[PDB]
């Protein structure tokens, strides 16, 4: 559950920029937008299973081999 625009003081528990997010687990590693949340956070059911929440990855990074 996301409480949109709340600080957790007022309500696992995680503070996002979108709000105090409850029942999801914070993960530092970044992945595709599976479920959108807001302010770059997304959530998914990746595996032994729970809902995770993480900062989304915009795509694979690639330094083009220009000279």
């Amino acid at each position: 559950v996301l409480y949109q625009g709340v600080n957790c003081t007022e309500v696992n528990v995680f503070q996002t920029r979108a709000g105090c997010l409850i029942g999801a687990e914070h993960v530092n590693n970044s992945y595709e937008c599976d479920i959108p949340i807001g302010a770059g956070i997304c959530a998914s059911y990746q595996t032994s299973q729970s809902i995770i929440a993480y900062t989304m990855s915009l795509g694979v990074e690639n330094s083009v081999a220009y000279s």
């Binding site: 990074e61 330094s63 083009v64 081999a65």
Partner: peptide
């Protein structure tokens, strides 16, 4: 904005 397939980044030179 998300028309690009990858996050391209510029070389050091």
């Amino acid at each position: 904005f998300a028309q690009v397939k990858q996050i391209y980044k510029t070389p050091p030179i």
